[PDB]
Structures are given as C-alpha cells and as structure tokens.
C-alpha cells in the first residue's frame, strides 16, 4: 500500500443521510455513482489493499465494493463518516471479503491515511514481504498482524504469483536504466545531477501501473 492523500471532504449526498435513517442499503444509485467518482479520483484505479486493478479502460466490469475501515456493528457512530470509506476489490480470498471473517483488535491496525506503510514493509524480487528490523515491539505487532488479517503474505500462489509476474515483466526497464546510470558514472558527472534525472524519468514511466510499489522498491536497491 501507499500513503493516500485525502483531499477536502466531498461526501455530497452522504451529508443528506443521518444517524436516524441508518439503513446503508437505502443509499441510492446516484449517491453510489457520485461516491465512486470521488473514490476513483482520489484512489486512482487500484485496490486500496492489494493494489490490483479494479477498473478497465472503459461489457463485463471488474467487481468492486465499498469497505468500512471500522466494523459497522461495533463502531456504528462512523457509519456515514467520510473518513471511514474505502474501495476494495471483489476477490473472495483477500482484502475486504476476508477481513470480515476474522477476529482482531482494531486498535492494532495500520491505516493508509494516518501512517506511511513504507516504514514497515520491504518487498523482494520474487514477491515476498520482509518486515524491517529495528522497529519497536508495538510496531512489530502491527506489521505482523496486518499481513495475517489481510492474507497478503501467503506461502504460495495468490497475490505472490501476480507480484512476481509483474516484477519479472518490468525487470527489463530496471536493467536498462541501471546500465545507463553505470555508463554515465564511468565517465564523470555529478551524482545528484544524474540521480535526479533518472529518478524523475523512472517515476514518470511507472505512473498508473499494477503493483507500482513493489517495482518502486525493487528499483532503488539496484540503483547505485
């Protein structure tokens, strides 16, 4: 995951509803379309948790649904709160559809809006996740439990197969760019001059791609 930059609130039709109404099912189709328009604008076209593509370049449409960060039954005070809304894929073995059937302490969950996830996780070339060292016991507890509840670190198959395929498909660009950088440092130039330019070009070419964070992390390590 990445750090989601929440914008100024735009709930619109959500303001019309109140606590007395409750009845999440009573939301109209136009209200859902407006909410999806905002979510798409803020979130891009990728899932919040697994970063799998959720919308094609518009017959069949990818399954998607709205998720609440906190459970509705326990935290009904946030049923219509704007900060509790998220977009999730329809995969029946991970993300929202998997969070429901699990027992966990909410107070020990990572929220993409509050804290930057890059301080905990560190992906590798073959698609597995490695927890960074030097963290406190509380942080290690959160990092170790969020993957378990989200099923984002399976032994084999699942998300790991797709992450590996994406990385091996994007490996050619990384190899070429690092070759150009190595050639440019074998003649003579300022390190920050070349580094800013390569980083800018690579960042420009990786916008709106599936699993962009894994390729991101796989890029700095190879880079000198």
């Amino acid at each position: 995951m990445k750090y989601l930059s929440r914008q100024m609130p735009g709930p619109s039709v959500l303001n019309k509803f109140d606590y007395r109404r409750d009845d999440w099912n009573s939301l109209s189709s136009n209200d859902k379309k407006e909410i999806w328009e905002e979510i798409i604008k803020m979130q891009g076209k990728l899932c919040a948790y697994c970063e799998k593509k959720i919308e094609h370049h518009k017959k069949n449409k990818v399954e998607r649904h709205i998720e609440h960060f906190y459970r509705k039954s326990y935290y009904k005070n946030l049923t219509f709160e704007w900060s509790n809304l998220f977009g999730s894929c329809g995969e029946p073995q991970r993300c929202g559809f998997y969070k429901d059937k699990q027992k966990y302490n909410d107070d020990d969950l990572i929220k993409a809006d509050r804290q930057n996830p890059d301080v905990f996780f560190h992906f590798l070339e073959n698609g597995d996740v490695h927890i960074r060292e030097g963290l406190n016991e509380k942080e290690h507890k959160m990092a170790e439990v969020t993957l378990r509840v989200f099923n984002l670190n399976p032994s084999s198959g699942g998300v790991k197969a797709e992450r590996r395929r994406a990385i091996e498909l994007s490996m050619t660009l990384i190899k070429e760019l690092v070759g150009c950088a190595s050639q440019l440092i074998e003649s003579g130039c300022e390190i920050e001059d070349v580094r800013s330019m390569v980083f800018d070009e690579f960042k420009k070419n990786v916008k709106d791609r599936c699993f962009t964070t894994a390729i991101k992390h796989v890029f700095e390590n190879r880079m000198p």
Partner: protein
C-alpha cells in the same frame, strides 16, 4: 417479416382452401420456408435451483462457444446433464404430438431439510422468436404439487412438423452429447457378432452417443460405397425397369400368399415398401440425384483433415467381408492397430459427419446445418501438439453449430477468446457453500500457456519442491546485501551441486551479485 405473423397467416389460410396443390404453391408457404431457413437456433440462458448438489445458479450461454473451467465437488458434468434434459422434450414433440419426454427422478432432489422441489429453466432464441421451458419436480409427501409448462415447446415443434408435412426435403436441428464413456465405445474392435433405406428420423432415436452407432456407421459406409458403384457401373433405365418388374413379381407373390405366415406377410410388405422407396429414389435421381460419390469423398476428406499423417482410406473386400484399410507412411494397417488418440478422433468426426449428412438431404453442402453439440473432456488422449489445433479445425469445419465444452488443460485454453471463458468457484458465504462465476481479467488469446494457467485457472505455475526452498532462501540472502556469509556459501554449494553452474537461472543471481557489489564499492568510496 415476423415468423409468428407468417405462421398464423398460413394457419388461417389453410382452413379455407381444401386443395393441397394450391397450398403447395401458395406465397404464404414460400415466405414461411424462406423465413425459417435464415434463422439460427441457439440457447440463451439457463438456471438451476436445488438440483443435485447445486443450490442456485444462473448462467448465460454464448452463441458460438463456451468453456467451463474449475474444479469442485459438485462436478461440471451435472450442468450438461441439465441441458440434456431440456432438449429431450423438444425432440419428443417433433416425433409425435404430445409425446412425453424425460422426467426428474425423486432421488435427484436435494437432501436438505429446507427444500421442497427442484426446477430447471431454459430459454431458446431463434432470430427474434423467444421460447421458454420450466421443468420441476416436488418431493414425496409435499403439501403442494408442481407441474411442467410445455406451451412454448409445443408451439415451436408445431412449426417444424407443419413445414416437414408439406415439403419432403425439410431440414431439422441437430442435438448430440458425447460423455467420457466414449473411450470404451472408441475401443470397439471387430464386429464381434443393414437397413435398405435411411431416413432422418433414424438418428432421433437417442441423444447420447453410445456403442451401437459405431456399428451402424460401418453399415452406412458400406451402403454409401455400393451406391457409388452403380454410378461407376453407369446403370441405365433398364435397372429401374428390372427393379419394377421384381416389385411387381413380389406383389403378385404377396397376393397369392394372401389367399389360402404373418411374419412372412410382414416381411413381404416390408420388402415391397423398400422396393417402392428405391423406385422413388430412382425417380429423384433424375432430379439431379445426390452425387453419392461426392458424399463419399466429402466424408473421407473430412476425416482425413484431422489426420494429416495418413495418405488414404479405402474399403477392401476379402474373405466374404469388408475391411477398412488405412495407409500411413508406407504401411497398410487395420483400424484395430491404431492408437487411442486416433481412434477417438476418428469416431467423433465420423459420427458428427454422419449425423449432419443424414439430417439435411436438400442442402448442396450438408455440413452447414444448425444445431447444438455438448462435449465433455475435449482433451482426452491428445498430446500438446494436437491440443493447440483442435479448436480451429472444429470451428472451421462446422461453422454453424453451437458448442459447449469443458476442459482441464491450459494449452486448449490459450487458443480461445476471453469472452467465452467462465470460471466456477466455491464461496463459504454465511457458513454455506455457494457457486460463483467469474471472467478472466485480461485477454488470453495468443499468450503463453504459463499466463493462461495463471489467469484462466488461478494456479501457481511454479512448483514448491525443497530445491525451490533453497533457491528462495539464497535469493533472499543475496537480495538483502548480506550475500557474504558462511551460510550463504553453504546454500550456494548445494544450489550449484543440484542445478549446475551453466544453468540460465544461476546467471541472473550472479549478475545481481555483481551489480550490487559494484554499487557497494561506489557508495563506500
């Protein structure tokens, strides 16, 4: 012009006029035939409720090809059974009015305590003509009873009966079903144990392919060959005159026997009917005949199209019997000396071509009729080379038939469009197993079989042996900059000992080590 409006117009015009020839040359009949010919028969939707192990399911069928992919305990076979039940009713009504079909037996209902009845709903589309059929059965001792609804089926079958009644060369739809037991049928060797006239109602006896059709196929081939011999003999009208004289003599003998032997009389009547049918066939021969030699070459060439390694097929008469001779390379073989794959691909195509040829006696090329075919386990006894070419040949030889197929291999799946793939998964929703249907995310036509395995079936294309565990641990060590370690050397010795130093896989990790080491040198300095 709507088909229904023309049908009712002909119905109301039929009552007034009693002369048959006026009807046989009326403009209404011509319009009805013209509109009935250019219409494509095809199923549209299907739904299942509490049938065997399925609780609730709705499926939309493509008009050209559909593939079912996935593994589960209920089994993808049962869905095909449901369709087979529905089509049986359509066939029965064509044979005779209000003939019963196939019912749902009591033991097929779900055994749960909260069920009372099971039902199946289907819809048939024909241009802009829509029909629907519901078939239901209730458990024993139920308070309320349920019955089938057969108005639409009887209405659709009435059109076919009406057209077939006035014109003697009507075309009829084709329905067939090939289960996984055909391997045994394909194993039939030798006779291990002759109809004079063949009609389009012969094939309508049964739906599912079984052993006896192979025997009948041999008989049909023999007959087809003998008729072509007459064409080679250049038989004149004298043969027809001799046949007529023999028919008259048989009639005289039957009349004499009728006076002062029920089986003998019945046999004489059957022989006279066969002679009359032969005389009518001879009369139809003057009307451009049918070029039986062309039919023989059409079936031979169609069989040879699927077996490119063979030279010719022939029928050889010896020892007072006919045997099939296969020429492969520079050798002659009998059909019992072939492999299993060639036997199965021989029988499937032979049966399909026989049914299509018999069902459309009017068309110039009878391989362009309409129908529906269901095939289970398409990839039986086929090596990967043949798996990648069967679909194109199937959809190019018979371009007007709708296929429903289940498969288990990624090689077959990599040659079909992503809009014809349905994936079945089980979800433990609300503490109850369900059945959901999904579609592939990306186009899978033309991609490698690894991607087709990853996307079209959702499975890891790489095993998880112990050596892969060593590989993953070593890759983690090198990728973590900590490659200079005694444990790393210990793992590396095992890796080289197993895979080998020249392996392409090891080269990539070595390159990674070199570039990382360089980066370290530059950063330190």
């Amino acid at each position: 012009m709507n088909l229904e409006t023309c049908y009712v117009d002909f119905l109301e015009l039929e009552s007034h006029v009693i002369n048959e020839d006026y009807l046989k040359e009326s403009v209404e009949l011509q319009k009805l035939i013209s509109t009935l010919n250019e219409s494509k028969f095809h199923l549209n939707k299907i739904g299942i409720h509490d049938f065997k192990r399925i609780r609730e399911l709705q499926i939309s069928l493509e008009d050209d090809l559909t593939v079912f992919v996935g593994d589960n305990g209920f089994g993808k076979s049962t869905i095909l059974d449901a369709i087979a039940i529905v089509l049986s009713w359509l066939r029965s009504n064509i044979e005779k009015e209000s003939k019963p079909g196939t019912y749902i037996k009591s033991h097929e209902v779900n055994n749960s305590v909260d069920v009372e009845y099971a039902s199946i709903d289907a819809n048939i589309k024909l241009k802009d003509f829509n029909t629907s059929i519901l078939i239901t059965k209730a458990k024993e001792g139920a308070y309320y009873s349920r019955n089938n609804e057969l108005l639409g089926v009887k209405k659709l079958a009435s059109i076919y009966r009406l057209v077939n009644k006035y014109v003697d060369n009507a075309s009829l739809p084709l329905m067939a079903y090939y289960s996984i037991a055909r391997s045994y049928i394909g194993g039939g060797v030798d006779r291990k144990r002759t109809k004079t006239v063949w009609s389009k109602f012969d094939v309508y006896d049964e739906i599912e392919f079984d052993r006896n059709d192979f025997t009948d196929f041999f008989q049909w081939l023999v007959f087809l060959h003998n008729r072509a011999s007459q064409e080679k003999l250049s038989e004149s009208q004298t043969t027809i005159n001799a046949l007529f004289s023999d028919i008259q003599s048989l009639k005289a003998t039957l009349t004499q026997l009728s006076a002062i032997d029920s089986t003998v009389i019945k046999g004489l009547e059957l022989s006279l009917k066969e002679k009359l049918n032969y005389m009518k066939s001879l009369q139809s021969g003057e009307h451009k005949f049918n070029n039986a030699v062309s039919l023989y070459d059409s079936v031979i060439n169609t069989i040879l199209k699927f077996l490119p390694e063979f030279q010719w097929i022939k029928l050889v008469y010896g020892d007072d019997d006919y045997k099939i001779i296969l020429k492969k390379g520079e050798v002659e073989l009998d059909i019992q000396q072939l492999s299993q794959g060639e036997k199965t691909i021989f029988t499937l195509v032979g049966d399909l071509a026989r049914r299509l040829i018999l069902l459309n006696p009017n068309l110039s090329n009878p391989l362009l009729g309409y129908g529906i075919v269901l095939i289970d386990e398409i990839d039986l006894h086929l090596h990967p080379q043949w798996q990648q070419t069967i679909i194109e040949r199937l959809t190019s030889t018979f371009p007007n038939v709708q296929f429903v197929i289940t498969t288990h291999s990624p090689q077959v799946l990599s040659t079909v469009s992503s809009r014809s793939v349905r994936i079945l998964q089980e979800v433990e929703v609300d503490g109850v197993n369900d059945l959901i249907v999904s579609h592939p995310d990306y186009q899978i036509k033309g991609v490698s079989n690894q991607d087709a395995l990853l996307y079209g079936m959702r499975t890891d294309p790489i095993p998880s042996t112990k050596e892969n565990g060593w590989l993953e641990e070593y890759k983690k060590l090198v990728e973590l900059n900590r490659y200079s370690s005694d444990e790393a050397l210990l793992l590396r010795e095992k890796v080289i000992k197993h895979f080998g130093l020249d392996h392409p896989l090891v080269q990539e990790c070595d390159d990674l080590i070199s570039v990382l080491e360089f980066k370290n040198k530059i950063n330190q300095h």
